[PDB]
Amino acid sequence: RAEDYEVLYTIGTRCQKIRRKSDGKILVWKELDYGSMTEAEKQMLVSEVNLLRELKHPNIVRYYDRIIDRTNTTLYIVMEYCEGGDLASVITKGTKERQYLDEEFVLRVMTQLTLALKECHRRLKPANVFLDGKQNVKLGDFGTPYYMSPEQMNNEKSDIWSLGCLLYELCALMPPFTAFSQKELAGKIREGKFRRIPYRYSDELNEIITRMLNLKDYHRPSVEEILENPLILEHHHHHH
Ligand SMILES: CN(C)CCCNS(=O)(=O)c1cccc(Nc2nc(OCC3CCCCC3)c3[nH]cnc3n2)c1
C-alpha cells in the first residue's frame, strides 16, 4: 500500500509530504519504526492510532489511513497536509521581521482552536498548530514547559490556560512567563503576573487572554463562554 504513494520530500524529523497516485492528492505521513516495539506495546500503538481515527473536524488535522511495511518494520500514518506550516514559524517570522500579527489573525486562531478543543473535550503549543491554504487553523496530534498550568504543576480549564499562553505568545511574540530555569519558571507561573499584550491590541482581546490566564481554573472562561465573546464573529471561523 505504500507503493500507492510517492514521497515528494521530507518535511521534518520522519514526517514526509506525499502524493497519492490514484488522484494526485497531497498528504503527509509519519513513519514509525516499530522494529523494537515489543508484542505487548504494539497493542497500545494500534488502539492509539484508531482513536486518532475518531476525530473528523475541520479544525483538527484529519487522519486518512495507516500503512504497514514489514520489510522495514515501518508503520506510516497518513494524514492531511497543512500547506501553511505551523504557528511556531509564524511567530518566528514575526520576531525576525519585527512585525506584530494582526488582531484579526489572533481572533481566528482563538475561535478555531477553541472549537477544536470543544470537540476534543466532547470526544497545545505553536509547533502543534497548523494553517491550511485558506487561513484555517488546525490542531495536530489530537525542554522547558512554558505553557504548564499552575494546577498541573501543583482538567478542561488547563487546556484554556494553555490556549491563553499560545494566544499571548501570538500577540507578544513571546510567552507570558519566561525564565532560564524550570524552578524559576514555576515561581513566575505561580505568581500569575505578566506584561499586557502590546497596545496595538484592543482591551477586549487583552481581557479575554488575561481571563484564560487566571491562576484559578474556575475563573477561566469555558469554551462556550469564550465563543460568546462579542469579539468572535462568523468570518473568524473555518471556511472551505
Ligand atoms: C517548530 N517549527 C519550526 C517546525 C519546523 C518547520 N516546518 S513546518 O513549519 O512545521 C511546515 C512547513 C510547510 C508545511 C507544513 N505542513 C504540515 N506539517 C506537518 O508536520 C511537520 C512536522 C512536525 C513535528 C516535527 C517534524 C515536522 C504536518 N503534520 C500533519 N499535517 C502536516 N502539515 C509544515
Side-chain angles (χ1 to χ4, degrees), residues 1-2 4-5 7-37 40-41 52 55 57-65 67-95 97 99-122 124-141 143-182 184-190 192-215 217-240:
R1 217 187 273 189
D4 297 326
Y5 302 82
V7 179
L8 301 189
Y9 54 87
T10 294
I11 299 175
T13 296
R14 292 190 301 175
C15 177
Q16 305 195 296
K17 187 170 177 182
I18 65 181
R19 174 197 275 148
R20 184 166 64 195
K21 287 175 175 186
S22 71
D23 64 342
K25 173 81 166 169
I26 303 313
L27 295 150
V28 310
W29 62 23
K30 310 275 180 62
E31 50 164 25
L32 288 296
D33 181 16
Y34 61 85
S36 304
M37 285 168 181
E41 355 263 275
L52 202 85
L55 292 180
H57 190 285
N59 298 119
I60 298 176
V61 171
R62 176 83 34 92
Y63 160 93
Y64 278 82
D65 203 13
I67 303 175
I68 177 179
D69 278 346
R70 303 176 290 99
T71 289
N72 298 332
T73 75
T74 300
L75 168 64
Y76 299 97
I77 297 108
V78 182
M79 60 198 63
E80 178 186 358
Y81 173 68
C82 300
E83 104 156 53
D86 72 345
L87 277 193
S89 302
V90 174
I91 289 170
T92 292
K93 185 176 183 189
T95 295
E97 299 182 10
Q99 171 73 54
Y100 282 132
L101 308 175
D102 307 313
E103 174 156 346
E104 288 282 272
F105 176 75
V106 177
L107 296 180
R108 292 193 157 80
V109 175
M110 176 174 66
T111 301
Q112 301 183 34
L113 280 186
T114 301
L115 288 167
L117 290 181
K118 176 171 162 193
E119 191 64 28
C120 282
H121 293 169
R122 164 198 163 273
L124 182 51
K125 71 176 197 288
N128 286 338
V129 181
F130 297 92
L131 301 172
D132 72 357
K134 310 166 288 194
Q135 307 186 295
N136 301 323
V137 188
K138 316 243 171 186
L139 191 59
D141 263 341
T144 166
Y146 286 117
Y147 290 16
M148 172 133 300
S149 72
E151 59 265 15
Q152 175 164 27
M153 100 183 331
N154 301 137
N155 194 336
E156 298 173 349
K157 292 300 186 79
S158 302
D159 291 342
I160 302 301
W161 174 277
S162 301
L163 178 63
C165 289
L166 184 157
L167 300 170
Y168 184 105
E169 183 169 7
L170 278 187
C171 296
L173 301 174
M174 67 187 60
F177 313 97
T178 61
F180 288 119
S181 86
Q182 167 98 249
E184 191 197 357
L185 182 66
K188 287 185 171 175
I189 294 178
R190 280 194 295 263
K193 293 172 172 187
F194 43 86
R195 302 192 62 76
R196 197 203 181 274
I197 59 176
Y199 290 110
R200 66 183 257 122
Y201 301 109
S202 66
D203 284 342
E204 290 80 6
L205 174 59
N206 180 71
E207 178 207 308
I208 194 179
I209 289 170
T210 296
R211 259 155 58 213
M212 296 181 207
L213 295 175
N214 206 276
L215 281 179
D217 53 7
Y218 48 84
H219 287 151
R220 309 180 195 140
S222 63
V223 295
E224 291 78 10
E225 284 167 331
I226 291 166
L227 298 167
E228 287 165 16
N229 195 287
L231 283 179
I232 298 190
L233 299 165
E234 197 290 325
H235 72 283
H236 297 129
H237 289 70
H238 90 83
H239 297 94
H240 294 287

